[PDB]
Amino acid sequence: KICLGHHAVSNGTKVNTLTERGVEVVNATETVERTNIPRICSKGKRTVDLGQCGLLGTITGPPQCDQFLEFSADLIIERREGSDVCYPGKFVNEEALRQILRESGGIDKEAMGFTYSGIRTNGATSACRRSGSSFYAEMKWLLSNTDNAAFPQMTKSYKNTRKSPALIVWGIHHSKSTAEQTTLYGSGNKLVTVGSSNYQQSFVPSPGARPQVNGLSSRIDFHWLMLNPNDTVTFSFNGAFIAPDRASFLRGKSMGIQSGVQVDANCEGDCYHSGGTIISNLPFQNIDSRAVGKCPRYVKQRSLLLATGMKNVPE
Amino acid sequence: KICLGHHAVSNGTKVNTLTERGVEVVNATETVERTNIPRICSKGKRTVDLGQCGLLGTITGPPQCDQFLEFSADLIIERREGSDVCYPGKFVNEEALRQILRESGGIDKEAMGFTYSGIRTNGATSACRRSGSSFYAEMKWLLSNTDNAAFPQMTKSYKNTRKSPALIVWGIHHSKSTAEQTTLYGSGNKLVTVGSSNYQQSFVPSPGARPQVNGLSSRIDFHWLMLNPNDTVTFSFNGAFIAPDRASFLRGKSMGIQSGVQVDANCEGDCYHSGGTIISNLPFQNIDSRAVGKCPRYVKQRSLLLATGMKNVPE
Amino acid sequence: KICLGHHAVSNGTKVNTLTERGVEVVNATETVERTNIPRICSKGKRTVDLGQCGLLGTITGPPQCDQFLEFSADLIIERREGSDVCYPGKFVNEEALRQILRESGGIDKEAMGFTYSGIRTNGATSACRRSGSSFYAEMKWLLSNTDNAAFPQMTKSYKNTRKSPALIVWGIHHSKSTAEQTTLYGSGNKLVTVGSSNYQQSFVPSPGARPQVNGLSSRIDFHWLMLNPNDTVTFSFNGAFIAPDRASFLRGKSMGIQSGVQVDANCEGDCYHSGGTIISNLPFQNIDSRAVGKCPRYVKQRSLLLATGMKNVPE
Amino acid sequence: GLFGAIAGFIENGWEGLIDGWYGFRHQNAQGEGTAADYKSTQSAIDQITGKLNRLIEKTNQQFELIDNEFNEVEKQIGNVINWTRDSITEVWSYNAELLVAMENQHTIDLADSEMDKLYERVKRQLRENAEEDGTGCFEIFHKCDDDCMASIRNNTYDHSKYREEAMQ
Amino acid sequence: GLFGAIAGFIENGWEGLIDGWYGFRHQNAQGEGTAADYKSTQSAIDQITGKLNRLIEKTNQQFELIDNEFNEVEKQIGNVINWTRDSITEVWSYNAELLVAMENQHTIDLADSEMDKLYERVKRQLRENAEEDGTGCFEIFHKCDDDCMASIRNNTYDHSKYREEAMQ
Amino acid sequence: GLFGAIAGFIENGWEGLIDGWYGFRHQNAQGEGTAADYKSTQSAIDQITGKLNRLIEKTNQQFELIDNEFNEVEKQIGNVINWTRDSITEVWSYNAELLVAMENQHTIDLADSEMDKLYERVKRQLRENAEEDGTGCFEIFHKCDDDCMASIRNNTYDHSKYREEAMQ
Numbered sequence A, B, C: 001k002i003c004l005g006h007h008a009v010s011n012g013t014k015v016n017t018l019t020e021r022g023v024e025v026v027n028a029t030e031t032v033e034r035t036n037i038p039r040i041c042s043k044g045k046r047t048v049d050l051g052q053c054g055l056l057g058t059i060t061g062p063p064q065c066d067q068f069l070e071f072s073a074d075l076i077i078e079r080r081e082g083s084d085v086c087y088p089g090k091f092v093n094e095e096a097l098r099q100i101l102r103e104s105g106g107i108d109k110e111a112m113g114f115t116y117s118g119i120r121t122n123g124a125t126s127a128c129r130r131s132g133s134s135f136y137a138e139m140k141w142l143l144s145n146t147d148n149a150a151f152p153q154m155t156k157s158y159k160n161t162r163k164s165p166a167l168i169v170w171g172i173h174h175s176k177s178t179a180e181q182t183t184l185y186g187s188g189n190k191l192v193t194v195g196s197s198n199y200q201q202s203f204v205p206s207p208g209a210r211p212q213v214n215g216l217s218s219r220i221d222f223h224w225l226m227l228n229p230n231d232t233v234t235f236s237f238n239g240a241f242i243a244p245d246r247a248s249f250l251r252g253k254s255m256g257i258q259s260g261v262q263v264d265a266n267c268e269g270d271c272y273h274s275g276g277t278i279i280s281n282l283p284f285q286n287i288d289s290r291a292v293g294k295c296p297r298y299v300k301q302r303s304l305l306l307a308t309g310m311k312n313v314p315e
Numbered sequence D, E, F: 001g002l003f004g005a006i007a008g009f010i011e012n013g014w015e016g017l018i019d020g021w022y023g024f025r026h027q028n029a030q031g032e033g034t035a036a037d038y039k040s041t042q043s044a045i046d047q048i049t050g051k052l053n054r055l056i057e058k059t060n061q062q063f064e065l066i067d068n069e070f071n072e073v074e075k076q077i078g079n080v081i082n083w084t085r086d087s088i089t090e091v092w093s094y095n096a097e098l099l100v101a102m103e104n105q106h107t108i109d110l111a112d113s114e115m116d117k118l119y120e121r122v123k124r125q126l127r128e129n130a131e132e133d134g135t136g137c138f139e140i141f142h143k144c145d146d147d148c149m150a151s152i153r154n155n156t157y158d159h160s161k162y163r164e165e166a167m168q
Ligand SMILES: *[C@@H]1O[C@H](CO)[C@@H](O[C@@H]2O[C@H](CO)[C@@H](O[C@@H]3O[C@H](CO)[C@@H](O)[C@H](O)[C@@H]3O)[C@H](O)[C@H]2NC(C)=O)[C@H](O)[C@H]1NC(C)=O
Pocket: B290, D068, D069, D072, D073, D074, D075, D076, D077, D078, D079, D082
């Protein structure tokens, strides 16, 4: 006599189908990745670990960013201990600027060529310490020559003679009081107008007490624009103005992540989250819905078993 | 002789398949929910029906919100007749603030401890009536002691000594004219600076005629920030400033809806829209694409019939 | 003897399935559209090709838009050479305003009825040339009667007596210097307050040097609001104010595209991109992910062949 | 269906078959009778019910308000939200349509399959004692009384017991 | 396919079969002939056409511009829009790929199924008068002239009429 | 499965079948033996591997950060982003669940199909020399030694060679 049959095993794997839940098959395989590598796998990639340098700091240059003023990178890592500032302050449209810098590939600095007469240009503070009182490396704190002297209305223009847009940053200084502002820049209302070809905006300083951060109750507002090739930016100001010394140009392309784990140049990855790297051939992941890079699609399920063998019918 | 066969009915149900439109099967069932319950089914849920109180009003306290100054809720219902204000005015970033309050679970108020000397603190208007002229219950309208007296530059600071962020609200008063503003706060330009640790912003009042709302051509601009634990907010102002009397702390979690239908504590639901509640075991709904809660997925089709029996082949 | 069989061909078409890549079938058909028509197929549709008129210009009326002050359209085409302005300047929330105008169906203008006394109303410039110096056709450049004369604080109100919202536009003029601004409007700080029922905002002009565009280092800031039926807008100003002469009302519905190709009234289409029209019965397209209208879904694949015949097994 | 039984070589269904999905209709000297087969019926029923249990599964994801019906949010962010919501609706309408169409094809095909499994089961019971007529019937080449029919229906029919007569 | 006819126990197709999808190729004393079966062919054709009619359905949803090709919108809202649009593209590319792959599997399998339905139909017509050779052919154990073949193709073949000879 | 072999008229699998997915278990005067059929096994294996190759395909689309874990972005744009991301997650969780369920149904059904193709293949080899017992076995009505069994397994069994004895 001759008989036809099929194989089976003592312990199969249960899977789900359209018509039944928990059908046992001879073998199955996982489609959802749960295994994380708790490092930033960066083998083969120009990596910049900003550490204590905040990403926006690379444009203005507080001391913690001196090593990063012209960085070049394929992968940019922000750290939780990063600070963008030394003299307290904050950027306008800060997140827009971060997203531009995360994908820039790094920055290339170039002097914009502003010269001054009739003012001081060496404003410094003990909050930006470089073996003494200093300031942002890419900026110039413009002052009256002497206390309460009038800050002359002045005009400074810069033409982007290069072929890619120029990142221009300036600052508005808000002293701790109306009285302190007059010693720095002279009395009266002070105004800074910014205009180019696709941008126009005015700024007036706002002196007043603020909570003391880094010993100071004053703050600097940092503003920026992208200046197109062959376009000109013109600054008209009469005080409380932190002038740009260099413009920034974007090098190419990169990606930025925010992580709390070490760099590992011995693993290779393309999908990152704050806890490390997702290295997987699987189409789905249940690790972090905010992972970035080239990633498996985040799904809410921890497991989706795909049958790789026939139904298991044991004896 | 012996014959095999299958069942049939006189009136089957037509469904669609991959290869054919309008195939008749013995039985089918609907997958798209169209039946609405025209009430807010709230059985089992701490519900707050704001009625004439606007959600933002619960922070500042116009008369219509006196009963809601420290509400607690799992479900918050805004009504079309709700008003956030008594003295005319509007919030900056109002929708951001509404979304925070809809999911807060309610608010817990606490005095911030500001004391004043050399000014009036009892500014009132007949637009905020409580058995006479009154004001926002959570605010203080700061004035010069007498007409045209100078409002002294003043500084008030508050430290969040609690463990969750503090919602701080203040107001900028724009009188109907430059002349009216000087009687309230003294002449000259007036400035209010707001600073904390992650926030910095200045405000100058703008007197002028506005259309008369509630009898007034003046308005109050309400501003807010969230103050982190152990962080400090400092107000520097010299007039036209509506000071906060209490800070708000979020209780937990909730959901907010906007409805025009009554509350029913005898039906249970988790998917709400302005016309009522969607209670359904079906995976899809064709009722309202803006439904919120735990909902069937909105689809454009009114009907998608799923076959639950074999093809119907009658005689 | 009798034999059963099936057909085959010498050259079949390879397709993909769930279990195999590159299976040969007797016939297959493409599901992804790659063929583009390099024209704006507009047969049957009231079309407005703005050409050198910028869409926002249709509200304020620089010379290039004189023919478009009350246009009516189902399809609105913006061109790369379009300009919204003559006297240099830019709109606040410009893109929000463009999206409103792209779907408006056109605009219907109506005089708002402002009358003036004690000022000039005929401000003109050689940048808005109509057989000489002119200005925006829908605006009025308000000036002091003579140089340095004080611009009187003034109030102008307009009630929307119609049944749909009124688009109100005004402008803030920033002269090239503080000195030029005083000749136009008199000395001192100048303020314009805008208030209605759901809007309140103040503006102060910012004189200063800006790069010269169209010969001018001055600029005009154009602002707008939508005024609800039976609601009133009130302007309080003392100079540097470009007043609206007419309000705009939206005609109905339309769609707006941005194109660089000619109009063809002999092809019919409903899916447009900058390079032309996608006319297809296919469910997917690989032409432009930013196509608008009624479109096939954009997909990254250039080809997805759907089997329309059996497996091809040749001899 | 794919298995060419239901609406295939079996000509139509039985409106008098009210106690099951599939069954036997017999004729012998004692007359005609019709009875339902429980096992095939319950297999089909169990599979359709499993499909239903999948489809009435609760979404446990909460979504909150991101715009405003009483006070419209700013136009640009509102246009972004409307476009996003309309794109998601596009996706879910497509998924619902495809899901139901695919599931209906498979339900119809699965019911077709259970009919064929029952037919072949009976065929294999009857061995060389019957011939198929092509309409879902087995011509029985031996006397088959009501008990004989009952044994076919409940799988106790011994083909050997009738083998001698039937071939003859 | 799932039914192991096409590209299965039937060895290959007929490039000379130009008037239908499936057919009969006969041999008798009068010679050989090939003719197409219309019913099976049209069943397969009708099913593939139904699939096509589903796929060429018009999306009646209008989408409007939410960014700007000439004057880029603000960076942050632009990054949100680009990400949303790229996510939707991810979803629709996945759906298109899956849809076509699934539909192609089912089309191939359905064509395989129609071949088997035709083969079994003929088998059931011929009853005990023929034997299958395993290649899609029925060895006929009686003289079957051109009219006899034609009656098999159009379902008028009476197995009884030849029963006596064929078993013999 | 849809083909009512595996977990169908074939009662259970063979845990001793360790060299293939499907096979033959014979009994004759020389004893019993079990061997695997390679062709059917590899067909099933090739089809499951093709499915796997589809599923381990790399997404070549890059997505970048649109919010901030260290410094939360503004609340409203953050609520729009969270809602968009949660909606996409809804869609991909649905797609993953549906994909695996559908693929598992088809994998089970395809394995069922290969078993039936092998059974019918053997049936067609054996012609009138055997009868099916209804459990996946063919009762052989002639002496079938180990070489005779081997010829059935590798398709060299000549039914004519035994035809005379077996019918007898
Ligand atoms: C985003 O889409 C919503 C719709 O889902 C738009 O809000 C809707 O706006 C329309 C007018 O454009 C309103 O239609 C009106 O309906 C009422 C009847 O209830 C009546 O006044 C008229 O029949 C009129 O057509 C509709 O009520 C309103 N719905 C909601 C839920 O807001 C909204 O405008 C879109 N967003 C943006 C920024 O445009």
